[PDB]
Protein backbone atom coordinates (compact mmCIF):
# COMPACT_ATOMS: atom_id res chain seq x y z
CA UNK A 51 0.00 0.00 0.00
CA UNK A 52 1.08 3.59 -0.66
CA UNK A 53 0.66 4.50 3.03
CA UNK A 54 2.84 1.58 4.16
CA UNK A 55 5.53 2.49 1.61
CA UNK A 56 5.36 6.17 2.66
CA UNK A 57 5.86 5.25 6.32
CA UNK A 58 8.67 2.83 5.46
CA UNK A 59 10.42 5.61 3.55
CA UNK A 60 10.18 8.01 6.50
CA UNK A 61 11.26 5.31 8.97
CA UNK A 62 14.37 4.61 6.89
CA UNK A 63 15.24 8.31 6.72
CA UNK A 64 14.91 8.35 10.53
CA UNK A 65 17.20 5.30 10.81
CA UNK A 66 19.72 6.95 8.46
CA UNK A 67 19.67 10.19 10.51
CA UNK A 68 23.16 11.00 11.94
CA UNK A 69 21.85 10.48 15.49
CA UNK A 70 22.66 13.80 17.17
CA UNK A 71 19.86 15.81 15.54
CA UNK A 72 16.29 16.21 16.77
CA UNK A 73 14.03 14.07 14.49
CA UNK A 74 11.15 16.55 14.09
CA UNK A 75 13.59 19.29 13.00
CA UNK A 76 15.62 17.22 10.52
CA UNK A 77 12.63 15.66 8.77
CA UNK A 78 10.11 18.52 9.05
CA UNK A 79 10.18 19.20 5.29
CA UNK A 80 9.62 15.49 4.56
CA UNK A 81 6.81 15.23 7.14
CA UNK A 82 5.05 18.27 5.68
CA UNK A 83 5.58 16.98 2.11
CA UNK A 84 3.99 13.63 3.06
CA UNK A 85 1.01 15.36 4.69
CA UNK A 86 0.77 17.67 1.64
CA UNK A 87 0.77 14.67 -0.74
CA UNK A 88 -2.05 12.79 1.01
CA UNK A 89 -4.21 15.88 1.70
CA UNK A 90 -3.65 17.56 -1.69
CA UNK A 91 -2.58 20.58 0.41
CA UNK A 92 -1.68 23.87 -1.26
CA UNK A 93 -0.87 26.19 1.67
CA UNK A 94 0.14 24.76 5.05
CA UNK A 95 2.67 24.82 7.90
CA UNK A 96 4.21 22.39 10.38
CA UNK A 97 4.83 23.52 13.97
CA UNK A 98 6.33 22.03 17.13
CA UNK A 99 3.94 21.57 20.05
CA UNK A 100 5.30 22.05 23.60
CA UNK A 101 4.59 19.74 26.56
CA UNK A 102 1.76 21.98 27.83
CA UNK A 103 -0.04 21.67 24.43
CA UNK A 104 0.81 25.18 23.21
CA UNK A 105 2.28 25.66 19.71
CA UNK A 106 5.68 27.14 18.84
CA UNK A 107 4.99 30.02 16.35
CA UNK A 108 8.30 29.58 14.47
CA UNK A 109 7.37 27.27 11.55
CA UNK A 110 9.41 24.07 11.17
CA UNK A 111 8.40 23.89 7.50
CA UNK A 112 5.95 25.69 5.19
CA UNK A 113 4.04 24.94 1.97
CA UNK A 114 2.71 27.65 -0.36
CA UNK A 115 2.46 31.28 0.73
CA UNK A 116 2.20 30.41 4.43
CA UNK A 117 0.78 33.17 6.70
CA UNK A 118 2.11 33.33 10.29
CA UNK A 119 0.30 31.52 13.13
CA UNK A 120 -1.13 34.32 15.30
CA UNK A 121 -1.93 34.40 19.04
CA UNK A 122 -4.84 32.08 19.93
CA UNK A 123 -6.55 31.06 16.68
CA UNK A 124 -9.73 29.17 17.64
CA UNK A 125 -8.95 26.23 15.32
CA UNK A 126 -5.40 25.86 16.69
CA UNK A 127 -6.66 26.01 20.29
CA UNK A 128 -9.52 23.52 19.82
CA UNK A 129 -7.16 21.15 17.97
CA UNK A 130 -4.59 21.16 20.75
CA UNK A 131 -7.19 20.95 23.55
CA UNK A 132 -8.97 17.97 21.96
CA UNK A 133 -5.81 16.29 20.65
CA UNK A 134 -7.82 15.72 17.46
CA UNK A 135 -8.16 16.92 13.90
CA UNK A 136 -10.48 19.92 13.67
CA UNK A 137 -11.81 21.68 10.58
CA UNK A 138 -13.79 24.85 9.89
CA UNK A 139 -16.22 22.82 7.74
CA UNK A 140 -20.06 22.80 7.91
CA UNK A 141 -7.50 28.36 8.84
CA UNK A 142 -9.17 25.38 7.12
CA UNK A 143 -7.89 22.32 9.03
CA UNK A 144 -5.66 21.69 12.02
CA UNK A 145 -4.12 18.22 12.41
CA UNK A 146 -2.18 17.34 15.56
CA UNK A 147 0.56 14.72 15.36
CA UNK A 148 -0.16 12.59 18.41
CA UNK A 149 1.85 9.56 19.55
CA UNK A 150 0.34 6.37 21.02
CA UNK A 151 0.67 7.85 24.56
CA UNK A 152 -1.40 10.89 23.62
CA UNK A 153 1.55 13.31 23.45
CA UNK A 154 1.04 16.06 20.85
CA UNK A 155 4.47 16.37 19.22
CA UNK A 156 3.55 18.71 16.37
CA UNK A 157 0.75 20.56 14.59
CA UNK A 158 -0.20 20.66 10.90
CA UNK A 159 -1.99 23.96 10.17
CA UNK A 160 -3.68 24.11 6.78
CA UNK A 161 -4.60 27.49 5.30
CA UNK A 162 -5.60 26.20 1.86
CA UNK A 163 -6.63 22.87 0.36
CA UNK A 164 -8.96 22.32 -2.63
CA UNK A 165 -12.63 22.18 -1.59
CA UNK A 166 -13.17 18.86 -3.37
CA UNK A 167 -10.86 17.16 -0.81
CA UNK A 168 -12.20 19.21 2.11
CA UNK A 169 -14.12 16.19 3.41
CA UNK A 170 -14.12 13.37 5.97
CA UNK A 171 -12.29 10.95 3.64
CA UNK A 172 -9.22 13.23 3.37
CA UNK A 173 -9.43 14.26 7.04
CA UNK A 174 -9.28 10.57 8.00
CA UNK A 175 -6.21 10.01 5.83
CA UNK A 176 -4.47 13.09 7.31
CA UNK A 177 -5.25 11.89 10.84
CA UNK A 178 -4.02 8.36 10.06
CA UNK A 179 -0.75 9.64 8.63
CA UNK A 180 -0.20 12.15 11.47
CA UNK A 181 -0.53 9.43 14.14
CA UNK A 182 1.92 7.13 12.41
CA UNK A 183 4.45 9.91 11.84
CA UNK A 184 4.27 10.91 15.52
CA UNK A 185 5.11 7.32 16.56
CA UNK A 186 8.10 7.19 14.23
CA UNK A 187 9.58 10.33 15.82
CA UNK A 188 9.52 8.74 19.31
CA UNK A 189 12.41 6.31 18.62
CA UNK A 190 14.78 8.71 20.45
CA UNK A 191 13.03 7.71 23.72
CA UNK A 192 13.66 3.95 23.66
CA UNK A 193 17.10 4.58 25.21
CA UNK A 194 15.53 5.35 28.62
CA UNK A 195 13.24 2.30 28.91
CA UNK A 196 14.20 -1.14 30.30
CA UNK A 197 12.37 -3.31 27.76
CA UNK A 198 14.36 -4.57 24.75
CA UNK A 199 14.01 -2.43 21.60
CA UNK A 200 12.05 -5.21 19.85
CA UNK A 201 9.60 -5.37 22.78
CA UNK A 202 9.13 -1.57 22.83
CA UNK A 203 8.60 -1.44 19.07
CA UNK A 204 6.14 -4.34 19.11
CA UNK A 205 4.15 -2.69 21.93
CA UNK A 206 4.02 0.66 20.13
CA UNK A 207 3.07 -0.79 16.73
CA UNK A 208 0.38 -3.00 18.30
CA UNK A 209 -1.21 -0.05 20.12
CA UNK A 210 -1.14 2.01 16.95
CA UNK A 211 -2.79 -0.85 15.06
CA UNK A 212 -5.47 -1.09 17.78
CA UNK A 213 -6.06 2.66 17.44
CA UNK A 214 -6.12 2.32 13.60
CA UNK A 215 -8.85 -0.33 13.88
CA UNK A 216 -10.93 1.43 16.52
CA UNK A 217 -10.78 4.94 15.09
CA UNK A 218 -10.36 4.36 11.34
CA UNK A 219 -11.51 0.77 10.72
CA UNK A 220 -8.06 -0.09 9.32
CA UNK A 221 -7.14 -3.79 9.12
CA UNK A 222 -4.25 -5.56 10.83
CA UNK A 223 -3.46 -9.16 11.74
CA UNK A 224 -1.66 -10.79 14.65
CA UNK A 225 -0.17 -14.23 14.09
CA UNK A 226 1.17 -16.40 16.87
CA UNK A 227 3.36 -19.31 15.80
CA UNK A 228 3.58 -21.80 18.64
CA UNK A 229 6.48 -24.18 18.14
CA UNK A 230 5.53 -27.47 19.75
CA UNK A 231 8.35 -29.70 18.50
CA UNK A 232 11.66 -28.84 20.21
CA UNK A 233 13.71 -30.61 17.53
CA UNK A 234 12.67 -28.08 14.91
CA UNK A 235 11.78 -25.07 17.07
CA UNK A 236 15.01 -23.11 16.79
CA UNK A 237 15.37 -23.46 13.01
CA UNK A 238 11.67 -22.78 12.40
CA UNK A 239 11.95 -19.65 14.55
CA UNK A 240 15.02 -18.49 12.63
CA UNK A 241 13.17 -18.90 9.34
CA UNK A 242 10.19 -16.95 10.72
CA UNK A 243 12.54 -14.20 11.96
CA UNK A 244 14.20 -13.93 8.54
CA UNK A 245 10.82 -13.55 6.81
CA UNK A 246 10.10 -10.18 8.44
CA UNK A 247 9.08 -7.59 5.88
CA UNK A 248 8.21 -3.87 5.93
CA UNK A 249 6.31 -2.55 8.96
CA UNK A 250 5.71 -6.02 10.38
CA UNK A 251 7.13 -6.52 13.87
CA UNK A 252 7.88 -9.67 15.82
CA UNK A 253 8.25 -10.82 19.40
CA UNK A 254 10.21 -13.93 20.40
CA UNK A 255 8.71 -15.40 23.57
CA UNK A 256 8.40 -18.54 25.66
CA UNK A 257 4.88 -19.42 26.82
CA UNK A 258 3.72 -21.00 30.10
CA UNK A 259 4.28 -24.50 28.66
CA UNK A 260 7.90 -23.54 27.90
CA UNK A 261 7.40 -23.47 24.13
CA UNK A 262 8.76 -20.95 21.67
CA UNK A 263 6.07 -18.56 20.48
CA UNK A 264 6.80 -16.07 17.72
CA UNK A 265 4.29 -13.25 17.59
CA UNK A 266 4.05 -11.34 14.32
CA UNK A 267 2.01 -8.18 13.86
CA UNK A 268 1.06 -7.18 10.32
CA UNK A 269 0.04 -3.50 10.49
CA UNK A 270 -2.12 -1.86 7.82
CA UNK A 271 -2.75 -5.23 6.16
CA UNK A 272 -6.05 -6.50 4.72
CA UNK A 273 -7.45 -10.00 5.19
CA UNK A 274 -6.29 -10.79 1.64
CA UNK A 275 -2.79 -9.53 2.56
CA UNK A 276 -2.67 -11.54 5.78
CA UNK A 277 -3.54 -14.70 3.88
CA UNK A 278 -0.95 -13.76 1.24
CA UNK A 279 1.66 -13.58 4.01
CA UNK A 280 0.98 -17.18 5.02
CA UNK A 281 1.10 -18.34 1.39
CA UNK A 282 4.54 -16.69 1.11
CA UNK A 283 5.64 -18.31 4.37
CA UNK A 284 4.62 -21.77 3.18
CA UNK A 285 6.80 -21.33 0.06
CA UNK A 286 9.75 -20.26 2.23
CA UNK A 287 9.21 -23.22 4.61
CA UNK A 288 9.03 -25.60 1.63
CA UNK A 289 12.38 -24.27 0.39
CA UNK A 290 13.97 -24.50 3.84
CA UNK A 291 12.68 -27.85 5.08
CA UNK A 292 11.19 -30.83 3.21
CA UNK A 293 8.75 -30.37 0.32
CA UNK A 294 7.15 -33.32 2.14
CA UNK A 295 7.14 -31.14 5.24
CA UNK A 296 4.45 -28.67 6.25
CA UNK A 297 4.68 -25.98 8.92
CA UNK A 298 2.34 -28.18 10.94
CA UNK A 299 4.46 -31.36 10.68
CA UNK A 300 7.41 -29.35 12.06
CA UNK A 301 5.29 -28.70 15.17
CA UNK A 302 4.04 -25.24 14.21
CA UNK A 303 0.59 -24.39 15.63
CA UNK A 304 -0.79 -21.27 13.89
CA UNK A 305 -3.12 -18.93 15.76
CA UNK A 306 -4.48 -15.81 14.07
CA UNK A 307 -6.19 -12.72 15.47
CA UNK A 308 -7.69 -10.13 13.10
CA UNK A 309 -7.81 -6.66 14.64
CA UNK A 310 -11.29 -5.17 14.31
CA UNK A 311 -13.51 -2.53 15.90
CA UNK A 312 -16.19 -5.25 16.04
CA UNK A 313 -14.18 -7.63 18.27
CA UNK A 314 -15.10 -7.53 21.98
CA UNK A 315 -12.73 -5.64 24.31
CA UNK A 316 -11.60 -8.85 26.07
CA UNK A 317 -10.78 -10.73 22.86
CA UNK A 318 -7.11 -9.78 22.47
CA UNK A 319 -6.49 -10.76 26.10
CA UNK A 320 -8.10 -14.16 25.58
CA UNK A 321 -5.99 -14.66 22.47
CA UNK A 322 -2.61 -13.75 23.97
CA UNK A 323 -2.97 -14.65 27.68
CA UNK A 324 -5.08 -17.81 27.44
CA UNK A 325 -4.73 -19.28 23.94
CA UNK A 326 -1.03 -18.44 23.43
CA UNK A 327 -0.22 -18.92 27.12
CA UNK A 328 1.48 -15.54 27.49
CA UNK A 329 1.27 -12.90 30.24
CA UNK A 330 1.12 -9.12 30.78
CA UNK A 331 4.87 -9.05 31.52
CA UNK A 332 5.56 -10.30 27.97
CA UNK A 333 3.03 -8.29 25.95
CA UNK A 334 1.35 -5.03 26.99
CA UNK A 335 0.04 -1.87 25.20
Ligand SMILES: Nc1nc2c(ncn2[C@@H]2O[C@@H]3COP(=O)(O)O[C@H]4[C@@H](O)[C@H](n5cnc6c(=O)[nH]c(N)nc65)O[C@@H]4COP(=O)(O)O[C@H]3[C@H]2O)c(=O)[nH]1
Pocket residue numbers: 051245246247248250268269271274275276277278279280282
Ligand atom coordinates in the same frame (compact mmCIF):
# COMPACT_ATOMS: atom_id res chain seq x y z
N1 LIG B 1 2.10 -7.55 6.08
C1 LIG B 1 2.65 -8.46 5.25
N2 LIG B 1 1.99 -8.83 4.12
C2 LIG B 1 2.54 -9.75 3.27
C3 LIG B 1 3.84 -10.36 3.58
N3 LIG B 1 4.15 -11.21 2.58
C4 LIG B 1 3.11 -11.17 1.71
N4 LIG B 1 2.17 -10.31 2.12
C5 LIG B 1 0.88 -10.01 1.42
O1 LIG B 1 0.72 -10.88 0.31
C6 LIG B 1 0.86 -10.14 -0.92
C7 LIG B 1 1.68 -10.94 -1.93
O2 LIG B 1 3.04 -11.03 -1.52
P1 LIG B 1 4.18 -11.60 -2.49
O3 LIG B 1 3.69 -12.87 -3.14
O4 LIG B 1 5.48 -11.62 -1.73
O5 LIG B 1 4.23 -10.50 -3.66
C8 LIG B 1 4.79 -9.24 -3.37
C9 LIG B 1 6.27 -9.21 -3.64
O6 LIG B 1 6.56 -9.90 -4.87
C10 LIG B 1 6.51 -7.73 -3.83
N5 LIG B 1 6.94 -7.12 -2.54
C11 LIG B 1 6.21 -6.34 -1.72
N6 LIG B 1 6.92 -5.95 -0.64
C12 LIG B 1 8.15 -6.50 -0.75
C13 LIG B 1 9.40 -6.50 0.04
O7 LIG B 1 9.51 -5.82 1.20
N7 LIG B 1 10.45 -7.21 -0.44
C14 LIG B 1 10.39 -7.90 -1.61
N8 LIG B 1 11.48 -8.59 -2.02
N9 LIG B 1 9.27 -7.94 -2.38
C15 LIG B 1 8.15 -7.27 -2.00
O8 LIG B 1 5.27 -7.16 -4.27
C16 LIG B 1 4.24 -8.14 -4.25
C17 LIG B 1 2.96 -7.55 -3.69
O9 LIG B 1 3.24 -7.01 -2.40
P2 LIG B 1 2.05 -6.42 -1.49
O10 LIG B 1 1.36 -5.36 -2.33
O11 LIG B 1 2.64 -6.02 -0.16
O12 LIG B 1 1.08 -7.70 -1.36
C18 LIG B 1 1.46 -8.79 -0.52
C19 LIG B 1 0.90 -8.60 0.87
O13 LIG B 1 -0.46 -8.16 0.75
C20 LIG B 1 4.49 -9.91 4.82
O14 LIG B 1 5.69 -10.41 5.17
N10 LIG B 1 3.85 -9.00 5.59
